[PDB]
Design a binder for this molecule. Structure first.
Ligand SMILES: Nc1ncnc2c1ncn2[C@@H]1O[C@H](COP(=O)(O)OP(=O)(O)NP(=O)(O)O)[C@@H](O)[C@H]1O
Ligand SMILES: CC(=O)Nc1ccc(-c2csc(N)n2)cc1
Ligand SMILES: CC(=O)Nc1ccc(-c2csc(N)n2)cc1
Ligand SMILES: [Mg+2]
Length: 417
């Protein structure tokens, strides 16, 4: 285990003292890593690991907050949500939960937080904030903004009238680890706060000339919408001359495939060719650089058996990629599994799917208005400036929601620095 910073240790201390806490910090400050250390330090009984999204839940071995709550979409009236939470399996999960971990809190809208808080009280019959559950919450409100299952403009989670009562303590992680380069760290920090000076703008524009690929590997284009990702990956695959090689997943419940898809980074049908640009979506070997996010290209298929792909990675290593398995925790503690190769096509990927990840071979076009925090998320995935190529950069792409700046300014009002 790595040596926790003083900041990271302080959060761990609070959690083990039984304090409900929100902890926050820039991209790559080790929030999710610290969640893993927290989960290891707690009894597994009574501790529930969630995140706002399926992609983020994977990073910590958890489930989605949606799946844990078991209140359907959460759009139904509170009384109907309570009844849903009273269902077998669901109910027990609420009753037995003493500590609830939530990563990537920035995607949870205030109305949903309010709903969960009320459900917690109703189901557990405990007249205390959040049913008396110890909340352990982290993320960055200057990253991806709240989504909604409804049609109204969402409020940030901190706008809930229950936020401060439910998470009375706030701590910060301030040392970025993802990037090693101070120039790049300082550049990302300016973007995160919406402060694009002439110098910042010039620096990002200069990346347009970066050749980020090496030896037949090309940059993954980060896109705002999955439609555009799917179309790009399919068209680039189709244009390759080789025969198609197919790898069909085996699911424990094929019928529930769609529930699996939301919490699992691999598809039912994987199609590959010589030359296919692929991303490894599971940590295989940290030492050999075979980690989640690693980019490579298919350099052959084995002659024998299933004809598994041989993949040359940007790092250097060339390796035959074997089947792996994901076991997802759905509603009411139901478990579903998928066996598949841990590969996705990677000429393109959505910014939402990169949430929480480190990447190192990325291109993005930043000349349009984006959602608050979305340009920052995209840029802050890259380990290094030289693995990033930004096209058509314009500060219009970089927006911070004023509500979030006000939140952060209020949060630090009494602090030393
Ligand atoms: N104490 C530490 N010492 C050294 N490296 C660390 C430490 N804590 C975390 N890291 C590394 O920091 C990197 C980023 O960690 P991660 O947990 O993804 O950050 P994050 O704050 O969750 N990122 P994001 O989800 O993008 O906001 C990982 O490669 C960790 O190994
Ligand atoms: C839970 C979940 O859906 N995870 C996930 C993560 C990454 C990707 C991915 C990588 S490259 C690409 N085109 N898409 C897809 C899915
Ligand atoms: C609760 C807390 O710690 N701070 C906080 C910050 C901002 C807002 C907000 C933005 S505009 C609006 N109507 N509400 C609410 C609360
Ligand atoms: Mg994270």
């Amino acid at each position: 285990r790595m040596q926790l910073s003083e900041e990271q240790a302080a959060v761990l201390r609070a959690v083990l003292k039984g304090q409900s806490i929100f902890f926050t910090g820039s991209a790559g400050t080790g929030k999710s890593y610290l969640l893993k250390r927290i989960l290891g330090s707690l009894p597994p009984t009574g501790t529930v690991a969630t995140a706002s999204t399926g992609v983020a839940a994977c990073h910590i071995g958890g489930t989605t907050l949606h799946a844990f709550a078991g209140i359907g979409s959460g759009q139904a009236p509170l009384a109907q949500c309570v009844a849903l939470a009273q269902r077998p399996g669901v109910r027990q999960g609420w009753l037995n939960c003493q500590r609830l971990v939530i990563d990537e809190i920035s995607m949870v809208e205030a109305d949903l937080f309010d709903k969960l808080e009320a459900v917690a009280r109703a189901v557990r019959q405990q007249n205390k904030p959040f049913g008396g559950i110890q909340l352990i919450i982290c993320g960055d409100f200057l990253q991806l903004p709240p989504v909604t299952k409804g049609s109204q403009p969402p409020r940030f989670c901190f706008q809930s009238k229950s936020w401060k009562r439910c998470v009375p303590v706030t701590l910060e992680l301030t040392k970025v680890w993802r990037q090693a380069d101070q120039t790049f760290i300082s550049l990302l920090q300016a973007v995160r706060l919406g402060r694009c000076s002439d110098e910042v703008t010039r620096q990002l524009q200069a990346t347009a000339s970066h050749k980020v690929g090496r030896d037949g590997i090309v940059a993954t284009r980060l896109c705002t919408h999955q439609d555009d990702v799917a179309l790009t990956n399919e068209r680039r695959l189709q244009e390759l001359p080789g025969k198609v090689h197919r790898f069909e997943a085996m699911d424990s419940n094929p019928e529930l495939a769609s529930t699996l898809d939301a919490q699992c980074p691999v598809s039912q049908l994987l199609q590959l060719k010589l030359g296919a640009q692929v991303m490894l979506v599971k940590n295989l070997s940290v030492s050999r650089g075979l980690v989640n996010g690693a980019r490579g290209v298919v350099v052959g298929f084995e002659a024998e058996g299933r004809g598994l792909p041989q993949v040359r990675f940007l790092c250097g290593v060339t390796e035959v990629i074997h089947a792996d398995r994901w076991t997802v925790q759905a509603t009411g503690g139901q478990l579903l599994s998928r066996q598949q190769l841990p590969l996705q096509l990677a000429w393109a990927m959505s910014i939402h799917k990169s949430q929480g990840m480190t990447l190192d071979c990325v291109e993005i076009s930043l000349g349009r208005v984006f959602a608050s925090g979305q340009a920052y998320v995209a840029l802050s995935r890259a380990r290094s400036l030289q693995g990033l190529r930004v096209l058509d950069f314009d500060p219009m792409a970089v927006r911070c929601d004023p509500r979030v700046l006000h939140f952060y300014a209020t949060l630090r009002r009494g602090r030393s620095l």
